[PDB]
């Protein structure tokens, strides 16, 4: 299934120039931001989906994540599969690792108060992370075999909700500037 969902949220800090391009393509050029999340993917996430992307530009100047980004409800859980970042590698409570798609990821949990909610309001968010141990090379076609992460998480006691909200390959930033250009499929 092709992408059907455009994610474009900013807390209003700084400049977030996001372009919804053709197909699965988007770009972001940002300057001195607060928090923002831009990406393309699917309105209804799946634990069985293989997300493909090609980040032709990954140029954060400060904190930016090049990451799968999604939510589940019942219960409310936010998840990430971070392939690359800028000046900050996100971490949390260490749970283990998972190998997937030619990389090794550390698995983390975190609980964030006053976090952006599914719709951009605020909420207490339980978050599951796979974070690559080194930044993934960009500019070639890349796969995130998400089932590998879901299964690894499950095996470490990290169960997702039964109701799936959106699931995107995102640029998230905080307190930074940068450029990204990503095609998702």
Ligand X SMILES: O[C@@H]1[C@@H](O)[C@H](O[C@@H]2CO[C@@H](O[C@@H]3CO[C@@H](O)[C@H](O)[C@H]3O)[C@H](O)[C@H]2O)OC[C@H]1O
Write out the residues near Zn ion by the rule CB under 5 A. 96, 119, 121
Residue 96: contacted member of Zn ion, ligand X, none (CB under 5 to 8 Å, by partner type) = Zn ion
Buried/exposed code over 86-125 (b: 16+ C-beta within 10 A; e: otherwise): beebbebeebeebebbebebbbbbbeeeeebebeeeeeeb
User: What is the Cα–Cα distance from 3 to 157, expressed in whole angstroms?
Assistant: 30
23 part of the interface to ligand X, by CB under 6 A: yes
Stretches 97-105, 150-158, 162-170, 176-184: which one binds ligand X (CB under 6 A)?
A: 176-184
Instruction: Give 39's contacts (C-beta < 8 A, 6+ positions apart).
Output: 7, 26, 69, 168, 169, 170, 171, 182, 184
Chain residue whose CB lies nearest ligand X: 56
User: What is the Cα–Cα distance from 144 to 185, expressed in whole angstroms?
Assistant: 11
Give the DSSP H or E segment for 147.
helix 146-155
C-alpha angle 61/62/65, rounded to 5°? 100
Residue among 127, 167, 171, 183 that touches ligand X (CB under 6 A) = 183
Residue 185: contacted member of ligand X, Zn ion, none (CB under 5 to 8 Å, by partner type) = ligand X
152 part of the interface to ligand X, by CB under 6 A: no
Residue 23: contacted member of Zn ion, ligand X, none (CB under 5 to 8 Å, by partner type) = ligand X
Residue among 74, 117, 133, 141 that touches ligand X (CB under 6 A) = 141
Which residues is 10 bridged to in the sheet?
36
Site for ligand X in 43-82 (CB under 6 A): 54-57
5 part of the interface to ligand X, by CB under 6 A: no
Residue 92: contacted member of Zn ion, ligand X, none (CB under 5 to 8 Å, by partner type) = none
Shorter beta-carbon distance to ligand X: residue 57 or 76: 57
- Residue 157 tokens read as 């006691």
- Residue 158 Cβ, how far from Zn ion at the closest point, in Å? 10
Binding residues for ligand X, per CB under 6 A? 23-24, 54-57, 141, 181-183, 185
């Amino acid at each position: 299934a092709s992408t059907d969902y455009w994610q474009n949220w900013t807390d209003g800090g700084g400049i977030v120039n996001a372009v919804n391009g053709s197909g699965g393509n988007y770009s972001v050029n940002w300057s001195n931001t607060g928090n923002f999340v831009v990406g393309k993917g699917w309105t209804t996430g799946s634990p069985f989906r293989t997300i493909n992307y090609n980040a032709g530009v990954w140029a954060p100047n400060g904190n930016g994540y090049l990451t799968l980004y999604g939510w589940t409800r019942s219960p409310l859980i936010q998840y990430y599969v971070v392939d690359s970042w800028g000046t900050y590698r996100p971490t949390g409570t260490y749970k283990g690792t998972v190998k997937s798609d030619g990389g090794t990821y550390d698995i983390y949990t975190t609980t964030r108060y006053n976090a952006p909610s599914i719709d951009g309001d605020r909420t207490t968010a339980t978050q599951y992370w796979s974070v690559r141990q080194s930044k993934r090379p960009t500019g070639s076609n890349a796969t995130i075999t998400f089932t590998n992460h879901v299964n690894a998480w499950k095996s470490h006691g990290m169960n997702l909700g039964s109701n799936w909200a959106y699931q995107v390959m995102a640029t998230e930033g905080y307190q930074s500037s940068g450029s990204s250009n990503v095609t998702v499929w």
